[model samples]
Target: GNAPSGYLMPAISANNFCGDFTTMTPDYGYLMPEKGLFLKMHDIRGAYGINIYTYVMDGDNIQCTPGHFVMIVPRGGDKLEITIKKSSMKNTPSFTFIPTPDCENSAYVATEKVAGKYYYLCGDAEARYKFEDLFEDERCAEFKNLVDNYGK
Candidate 1:
């Protein structure tokens, strides 16, 4: 399948790296106000970290659209890195995450954590967006349910 238009492919890899790897769930929803987009993070089975899924509103249906899966790794402490790869090519350059001021939790720090100032840029445009975590929001719950029960 083709990736969504404007979707940025990842350009990094974390293979051959060994450390205290951790896991996280997308209990909190993220909102990119700049583009009015929503993102849901999910744990990748049989992998080291999470894969981000991007979405957009479609009248009554919030489509869980396709995009290059952004693979993320927790670097311990408040540090994190992300990488992306296409099926036919090598992984992209690993990019570090920039935490917003006053942020207390890294993605690996805890479960059901709020995004709290965590953002990153990729591609030539340096496309960056702040992930404003939505805690206990109904929309978040709705989207989670949709993905979890999707194709069932």
Candidate 2:
């Protein structure tokens, strides 16, 4: 199947990366599973560190979702250096994530080759419109811009 039209990878500016990596779940709900694709942060205490888990919708249906656990480790720094570690690509026999070409230049994102091909869930910028209800406060306002300008 083809990716949705005008669909780009997730974008996180350096300003937005402030505070903690914990923003993904409670603030943005990007990892809610209902959003089609997201990365969940685990064991976050204050502003120190976290482990990232990958999740993607298997298809149009919610129940078809699959998860890849603890693949990303954020090394401490001002610029986010996400070190992609070796992890089994769980249940990805079909669809795999591809971050947009622009994200290739981001110091924020790093993907490791598994067997051969590169793999990482940067996120689905297209899915924000479908799941806008998940964001709140500053996060909502930020994502609403993505929703409003989705195809423009």
Best of the candidates, lDDT: 2
Candidate 1, residue 141: CA error in Å? 28
The lDDT values for all models are 0.31, 0.32
Any residue pairs clashing in model 2, and if so which? Answer: none
State the RMSD for candidate 2: 16.6
lDDT of 1 at 84: 52
Report the C-alpha displacement of residue 106, candidate 2, in angstroms. 34
> Across residues 14-106, which tens digit of lDDT does each residue of candidate 1 receive?
321122222312222343434334343444542222233344544433333333344445465644454653222143112223322232222
